[PDB]
Amino acid sequence: ADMTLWTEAEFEEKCTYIVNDHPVQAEASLPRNLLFKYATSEEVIGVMSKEYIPKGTRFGPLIGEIYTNDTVPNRKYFWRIYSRGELHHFIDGFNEEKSNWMRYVNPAHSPREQNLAACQNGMNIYFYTIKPIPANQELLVWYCRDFAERLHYPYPGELTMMNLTQ
C-alpha cells in the first residue's frame, strides 16, 4: 500500500481510478475534480483539488509539443521520454495552446508535501496520487523512483549509504 517505491508498471497495474481531461487548451482541459490556484490577477499559479481525491488516482496523459534533439528550437516545462533505456524525446508543456493543465502542477519540495508521482507508461507521462488529497489542497508532484533514477535525481525512499552498508 506504500506507493513510494512502486515501479512504473506497478502504478499502471494497481491504479484504482482513472481521471481523463475535461472534453486555451491548458486551462480548458482541467478535469472537473480540480480547480486552479490564482494569483491575488487571473494568472494560474498551481492546481488544487475541488473535492476529495482518492489515493491511487491517475491523471493524464501529459499533453505538450514534442521535440527530439534534432528538432528542438525554455526547458522549464520539459518532460523526458525514454525508449529502451535511452532518451528518445521531450514533451514541452510551455505553450498553453498546445499543452494540457498538467503544466500548471507545481513540484513537491519534500516527501511530506508530495501527493503525486510522475511516471512514464508506454510513450506517455501520467501523474498518480500516492496519498488522498482532501478538498482545496494543492497537487504537488515529484518523479517516481524509476523516473528519478533515469534523471539521476533524488526521490522519497531513496536508499542512503547507511542503508546500503548496514
Place this chain on the structure above:
Amino acid sequence: SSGLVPRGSKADMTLWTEAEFEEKCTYIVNDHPWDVQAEASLPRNLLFKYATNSEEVIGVMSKEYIPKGTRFGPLIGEIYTNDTVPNRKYFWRIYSRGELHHFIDGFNEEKSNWMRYVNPAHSPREQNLAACQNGMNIYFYTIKPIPANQELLVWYCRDFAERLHYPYPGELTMMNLTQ
C-alpha cells in the same frame, strides 16, 4: 595583505569529477613491489586490521599520517565481461563511452591487490577515500587527511556513484533542488 589583492578571483573534493581527481591529486602511492598478492602488495604507509586473535584481514589502516589528495591504486583483480563472468562482493564496474564494459573482481586474493580489503564508508562523515575510474583503471584518492592508525573507508565519487544509481556524499535532496 587585506582585500581585493590577496583575495584574487574565485579545496572540498566532495563534488570533484574523476578528471579533477586525476589532475589535482598531490601524492601518488604505488603498491609495494610486489608478490599472497593481496597482502604482499600493501603499500608501506598502511597496515592491515585483523580479526581478534586471528590472522584474518578485516580492513586497512594507516601506518602514518596520510595527506589529503593521495592516490592509491590501480585496483588489481580478475576481469570479467557479461559474456565471461562465472559472488559479486568484490566487484567493481568499468565503463566505456557511457556503457558498462567489464568487471574487476577482487575476490581471489592470489589475483587481486590489497584494495579488495578496504571497507566502504557508512556515512559521508566516515568517508576518507573516493573511488574513481581514470582511463581503464580504478584508483582511490584521499579526500581528507588520514591520521596514523585510522581505518581507510571508501565510497564512489559522484560520477561513479551516478553510473551505479547509488547515493553519494554531497548529493542534493529534493529540498535543495526545489529551494
